[model samples]
Target chain A: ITRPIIELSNTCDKIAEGNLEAEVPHQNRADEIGILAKSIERLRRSLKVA
Target chain B: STITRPIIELSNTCDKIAEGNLEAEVPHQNRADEIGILAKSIERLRRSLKVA
Candidate 1:
């Protein structure tokens, strides 16, 4: 559980740094953090489309 | 493990929202437990943030 958050945070931090190349994981986790990862992945995809 | 992990993760989700990340969606919102309450609360918050 804690591992997932730290991993997710690393990915999100990269994206926050404007690195859309980062991949979002844990969407298959079915937990609160996974949902965020899914959304952030979508957000990243959005940026890529722009 | 269930209660603590979920609570911490949920709390972190709240932190994400407060940090202006609305990309998140809540889980277990249909449950009758307090987790459901929290999930629904966050869901409500996400919706409000989306519109406003």
Candidate 2:
């Protein structure tokens, strides 16, 4: 639980901190952590596009 | 459905999850589209369902 969530958070932090291409990790899970991966991916793409 | 196919599938998963199929797994978290966020929220909701 903590592993993926923390990984997702760190990946999201990278994305949020302007590291747009640092692919959001743990995106393949079947749970909330996976969902967060999608959210960060969306942010990365949205940031790059903007 | 910007790309259409994945969104369709994502929505389908939501429907499956909402329809009392908690074991269904979501897809495309690695995608970099707005649908990705929706996928996130959907799976988040799915998790909540699991807890409650």
Candidate 3:
């Protein structure tokens, strides 16, 4: 559905729940959400192993 | 027909939650469903209700 969107909200939810590496499913999407996903990925790195 | 609206809503929700509003309630706009588009914006504004 909706081209199988990739999003960061799930990531934030996971982090808020204390899951460090939440195993995001990578997918192709429009620019806005894609950037949002990237930011979440970066946030993961910082939160986990920086 | 487009996800721009709900996507924006989810984005803002994430931002607010990230800023520590973990209790933020994101109303289901069903952006994937055309008829309920307005509901999505309603949830967005509701999150800012106290500020407004």
Candidate 4:
């Protein structure tokens, strides 16, 4: 429950620091967290593309 | 309290999404208010981007 949110926050912090390769480990959550994980992965790809 | 908890969570998630964090959870779909609508919109956006 709480773990996914915390992990997401930490992953976002890493992405903010230019660590776009940092993994998002919650994509299989079947909840909003999974949706978020996919979105973040897209963001990383978009960033890399740019 | 159930309502409040989901509301707060949704609000915080929106803030993150607005900042381009797009990684914020949309865990408040059980509501029947504007928040639920917005959550669905956000989820749609995520799905769209994900398919791209």
Question: Which candidate wins on TM-score?
Answer: 4
| Tens digit per residue, CA lDDT, model 1, A1-50 | 55665565566556555676877788786666666566556655644544
True contacts kept of 2: 0.00
**Best of the two (1, 2) by lDDT:** 1
Tens digit per residue, CA lDDT, model 3, B1-52 = 2566555555555455444453677645554553133334334333433231
For candidate 4 chain B, the 10 contiguous residues with the lowest summed lDDT are B43-52
DockQ category of candidate 1: incorrect
Model 3 agreement with the true structure over A1-50: per-residue lDDT tens digits: 34324224444555535565676444245665664455444544444432
Best by DockQ: 3
What would the per-residue lDDT of candidate 4 be over residues A1-39, giving only the tens digit for each residue? Answer: 556555655665566566758886777766666666666
Which residue segments of model 1 deviate by more than 4 Å?
A: A1-50
Better of 2 and 4 by DockQ: 4
| Clashing pairs counted in every model | 0, 1, 0, 0
TM-score for chain A, candidates 1 onward in order: 0.71, 0.77, 0.61, 0.83
TM-score of each: 0.46, 0.46, 0.44, 0.49
The docking quality of candidate 2, as DockQ, is 0.03
Off by over 4 Å in 2: A1-50
In Å, residue A42's CA in model 1 sits off its true spot by 24
